[PDB]
């Protein structure tokens, strides 16, 4: 009927969490994309600020519904496209387990990694020291606990909560790489996620673009 | 049958978002409380760290389900206690609208206000300057847009998304008060929230405790 429109830039880990979800749900053909290029300041145009006063990506518009957080976009796409499949959130406890880990990404992992990555990119951080990376390492410690108790981040099956987290892990991993000695379950989970058939197009392309910008700033 | 247990300290805005939700849903007698006192470091005890490696409140345990983010706790309590009432999230678009504003609180308003409040309390900030408060004021600007387009934060009815946001607004308002000239819709919404019959017990008690600690540090 009516197709959701995803406003996006794939250098963003929040955006790539959604792109991974879209591919995993098999709904690439049901979700139209609209590029909003951050480095060219397209997120500050009047139309986009009216759509989202946070002037941030991703945004999903579906009819008159406007969602302005990747984690809300992901749960909504699950509800309307994934009810009868491997990513279903119909059961209340399963939905809460998944939402719990989405909150972990939004409020812990993404918050802490974004501080480091933005600071490096805007040159306010010119040398990474121990204090810069401790909050990220503490988030890795929590993730390692979760992946000791279940095979994937929210339960023993892959869920949509694995996607925002791997989008963040593949971003801050550029500056804070996983040690297999320190975080063995997280390192093995990360390698497993990288083997998903849609990982290259939905996540690695944007990671590669970010890595190029980081190398230039840091040289 | 089996009662959820809420691990809590009401000086915390995330906790008070849940306490407001519990009162609004009429389920105070269905949710057992377990005090975890932050100032006495009870959140660092081995049992609690095993329950939640983030060593933070609130936590909800319901049978074997352990939720470790106020926003996930609130949506879960809606699903299992509020399906047939004024706070229902059964409709997918309504659920997404509410979740969208929960994400705003968790990832924007709470993140920005907590930085300021924690910094004042640990004395790392000894004088509030313009740069300290600009991110909070930008969050107020977004809230004002939301409350121009709907009567409450997520739609024209009160929802559970109003509760985490008012818990934060009543905390950082101590140092960054709302101007009725700058944010008229937000100021009127805030006064309306303060008139809810459960606001005093569920939120003001904890705000009062925090205000006392702030005054002492800042004198
Ligand atoms: N919690 C939000 C975070 C969104 C966000 O911060 N997006 C960034 C890119 S990673 C952005 O568009 N920033 C633009 C700006 O800050 O002006 C989500 O998960 O969608
Ligand atoms: N996103 C979390 C935030 C929880 C949080 O940060 N709680 C604080 C109190 S406001 C805490 O318990 N901090 C203890 C610590 O940082 O060790 C939620 O909404 O539940
Ligand atoms: Ca198309
Ligand atoms: Ca161009
Ligand atoms: Ca225009
Ligand atoms: Ca009781
Ligand atoms: Ca005591
Ligand atoms: Ca013990």
Author numbering:
A (entry chain A), B (entry chain A): 1 to 219
Task: Tell me what the authors wrote about this structure, in their words.
Here, we report that some flavonoids act as the inhibitors of the Ae. aegypti Noppera-bo (AeNobo) protein, which belongs to the glutathione S-transferase (GST) epsilon subfamily. Nobo plays a specialized role in the biosynthesis of the principal insect steroid hormones, ecdysteroids. AeNobo adopts a canonical GST fold, which has a well-conserved GSH-binding site (G-site) and a hydrophobic substrate-binding pocket (H-site) adjacent to the G-site.
We prepared a purified AeNobo recombinant protein (220-aa length) using an Escherichia coli protein expression system. Gel filtration chromatography revealed that AeNobo forms a homodimer in solutions, suggesting that its dimeric structure is a biological unit similar to DmNobo and other canonical GSTs.
